[PDB]
Amino acid sequence: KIQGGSVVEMQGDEMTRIIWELIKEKLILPYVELDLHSYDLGIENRDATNDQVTKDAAEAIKKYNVGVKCATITPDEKRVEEFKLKQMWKSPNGTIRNILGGTVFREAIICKNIPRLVTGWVKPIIIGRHAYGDQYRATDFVVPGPGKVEITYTPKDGTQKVTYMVHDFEEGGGVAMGMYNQDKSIEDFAHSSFQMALSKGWPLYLSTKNTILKKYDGRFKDIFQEIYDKKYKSQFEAQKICYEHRLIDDMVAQAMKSEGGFIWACKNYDGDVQSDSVAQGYGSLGMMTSVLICPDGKTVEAEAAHGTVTRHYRMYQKGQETSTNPIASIFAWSRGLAHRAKLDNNTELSFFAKALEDVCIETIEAGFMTKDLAACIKGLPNVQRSDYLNTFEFMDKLGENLKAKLAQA
Amino acid sequence: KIQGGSVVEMQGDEMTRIIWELIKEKLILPYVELDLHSYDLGIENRDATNDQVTKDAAEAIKKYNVGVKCATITPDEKRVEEFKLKQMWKSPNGTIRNILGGTVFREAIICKNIPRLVTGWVKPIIIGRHAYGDQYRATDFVVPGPGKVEITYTPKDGTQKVTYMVHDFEEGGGVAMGMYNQDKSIEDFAHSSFQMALSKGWPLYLSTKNTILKKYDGRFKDIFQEIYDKKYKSQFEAQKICYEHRLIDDMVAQAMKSEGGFIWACKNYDGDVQSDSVAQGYGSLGMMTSVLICPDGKTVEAEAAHGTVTRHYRMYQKGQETSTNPIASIFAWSRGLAHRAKLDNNTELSFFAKALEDVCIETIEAGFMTKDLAACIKGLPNVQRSDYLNTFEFMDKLGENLKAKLAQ
Ligand SMILES: NC(=O)c1ccc[n+]([C@@H]2O[C@H](COP(=O)([O-])OP(=O)(O)OC[C@H]3O[C@@H](n4cnc5c(N)ncnc54)[C@H](OP(=O)(O)O)[C@@H]3O)[C@@H](O)[C@H]2O)c1
Ligand SMILES: NC(=O)c1ccc[n+]([C@@H]2O[C@H](COP(=O)([O-])OP(=O)(O)OC[C@H]3O[C@@H](n4cnc5c(N)ncnc54)[C@H](OP(=O)(O)O)[C@@H]3O)[C@@H](O)[C@H]2O)c1
């Protein structure tokens, strides 16, 4: 077996938790020896530890520089009842990203045989999603009745306290929230986006809504311009690429009619939403990579961008055949292992991480596919059961195809 | 000429302001006589009136129940320099939607001969965008340096204050903002969405992020469920349709791969962003309806959902040929006139509003179209100037076909 090194692993929930075991059992552990630091981020063990396991996992990623994460449940009211939880725990992803910081870079996994839903996307679209702040570290509450909601800033220095009226509720109640972001975090966000654009050789676009959030989003736009003009403007010219700020609604329209081949710097919320749209446009939520690259340049957290796929977990619980796509969870392992190999100049691990990705593509392009991708080719009404493999047949086929590729080399 | 009635009109900026005139002079007032109350909401007069023109127009819509609005400029810092304005004026749309409230219903305008960019959308997607609150009535500010940002609630009855920590900036500054929403507005939002689904015969989906905004977005989710179970669930089952809540990121993916045929209840921000994504998916940003339906059930504001097309306006300024799609601006008039005809039982005006929309569709499907629609057919690189009409020849042909349809 290859000696892989130290890797922080985080277990998830429902359908992805099951696929996670198959990946470890059929594709990884037979060929790689790892100092696997495992953290159960399943909903029950997060509840049992009062979510401390989530903060422990984040700290381990700081120590060992590589984390691979399975999709997890973020509970609302209906999940508190289903699992008898103590409280509505925050998203484990929000907690992990808030401790590490950085940019979540997402990108579709492309197969030559899979038609897109968007006709023009002949090149990849890479989304750089800011991983900090905004709605994912906000403080929201219900306004019970009439009253004023105000937002106040108290400076650390000589007091110049400022009180802003949010809304005076004259009758009835409602909702209110405050959210924030950090100058330093936005600077890291900008650097990560300019570097990625230059590294790939593609233009870079940043989307905000600064016409409406004039000071909030205007900070994002200004900091990108300043960093561009001071550190990156010349290297952009030398590579024959450009940087441009666009309104977010203009940007989604341009992306929809684009040919692809650009970097898309997104604020936290838009990066969430638009990365599922892009992934689905290219084929399936199961065909997309997601890597949190930290500002240190050395630490990464690879993950599946999709959720736990509970709707498929429901069918599995009623003993109905499931055809869930494991590729995004598999590429979380391979991308994490690839970065682990790059930190240690591990030749054998680099080759294994590439071979494991090559096996996924080669298998799909040969006609062996989960139902989601078979629907891309034939159209959902024209799909028969012969057109695809169930969840377990597909991972059986990847396990066989990987064993053969590794036996050959 | 037809006796149209009282209609509030709001002029806009740049390329849309040019197109707006052409519509009035070629397609409306030659055939309709209207008590037209015109408000110049262009950036020039909004500055001159200190945006009092925008508040005046919104008040006029409340009295006369029908407003038609041209696309306008929302100024950034970079447009304060271009016209040397007093301040960064707020969005006239936000101001108008805030005074009226309600839901902005958006839907693509379909033509037989125009391929989509999204393969599977064979049925219409209608987005119901909540028009009140959230980012569009928010208070944002720059955090200059280290300090504490808190949000407070003081009840009116004099009971105890509650303060929540937003963020303690230990080093450096950043940004912060507060935003809110109102129960009654959410209820009106929910009623309009269940009713529209029942009117169209399609299922209804609401998108929020209640796993993250547990109390803020949970309120939206809970109020829809309560209104569904108590008032609309039984009529839904009788019509073989349904309502379901979905997280926004799952929702945008489902919509992308769907066949269409559903109502999409969106919060203010998502309704903004996603309606331009859907419009571009079907063909072009200029082929989309946008109608603000107020909770009172009588007043309505139709608009062009797109922007002012400044890229074409720059070419227009530099004396270069343009090919801008006027149909969204044309439909704002027809939708406005149609509702005016519904309130006055004006059979003739009802017919005129439909004839004007049919002529637009019939024109494109006969092969006479703007460049954006020609690019949908041939692909933008393979489009020649013989493949399309410019902005002014296209509205010339619409004038001819509309006069012929009305005479016959
Ligand atoms: N990274 C994360 O940890 C993360 C991200 C998002 C959501 N979540 C959590 O996951 C739970 C479910 O959320 P959700 O259902 O809204 O999001 P989701 O699990 O990503 O959505 C599942 C739906 O999207 C499609 N889909 C997603 N992944 C797929 C795959 N690998 N193969 C085939 N189809 C796939 C399926 O649509 P069809 O039903 O049409 O097959 C499925 O029903 C929630 O509790 C949420 O908190 C976690
Ligand atoms: N409803 C409103 O009043 C509204 C909404 C949004 C923005 N705005 C304002 O508009 C100003 C700038 O405009 P924007 O950023 O929104 O740009 P935009 O008008 O969305 O135009 C962006 C691109 O979309 C295409 N496009 C849009 N409308 C079109 C039409 N009717 N026919 C053909 N092509 C069309 C053009 O594509 P090409 O690249 O092919 O030219 C154009 O370059 C902003 O200051 C903002 O305040 C107003």
Numbering used by the authors:
A (entry chain A): 4 to 412
B (entry chain B): 4 to 411
The publication says:
Isocitrate dehydrogenase (IDH) catalyses oxidative decarboxylation of isocitrate to α-ketoglutarate. NADP+-dependent IDHs are mainly located in mitochondria and cytoplasm, and play an essential role in cellular defences against oxidative damage as a source of NADPH. To investigate the effects of Cd2+ on IDH, we determined crystal structures of mcIDH alone and in the presence of 20 mM CdCl2 at 2.0 and 2.5 Å resolution, respectively. The structure consists of a homodimer in which each subunit comprises a large N-terminal Rossmann fold domain and a small C-terminal domain and β-hairpin clasp.
In the structure obtained by soaking a crystal in a solution containing Cd2+, strong electron density equating to a Cd2+ ion was found in the active site. This Cd2+ ion is coordinated by three carboxyl groups from aspartate residues, namely, D275 and D279 from one molecule, and D252 from the other protomer of the dimer. The guanidinium group of R109 and the carbonyl oxygen of A308 also participate in Cd2+ binding. In the active site, unexpected electron density was observed near the nicotinamide moiety of NADP+ that reaches the sixth position of the octahedral Cd2+ coordination. In the crystal structure of IDH soaked with Cd2+, another region of strong electron density was observed close to C245, with small areas of satellite density, indicating the presence of a second Cd2+. We placed a Cd2+ and two water molecules at this site, and the geometry of neighbouring atoms was found to be suitable for coordinating the putative Cd2+. Thus, interaction of Cd2+ with C245 was observed in the mcIDH crystal soaked in a solution containing Cd2+. In the crystal structure of the mcIDH–NADP+–Cd2+ complex, the cation is coordinated at the active site in the same way as Mn2+ or Mg2+. Because Cd2+ was coordinated with residues from both subunits, Cd2+ successfully brings the two subunits together to form a functional active site, as shown in the crystal structure. The crystal structure of mcIDH with Cd2+ reveals a closed conformation with an α-helical regulatory motif.
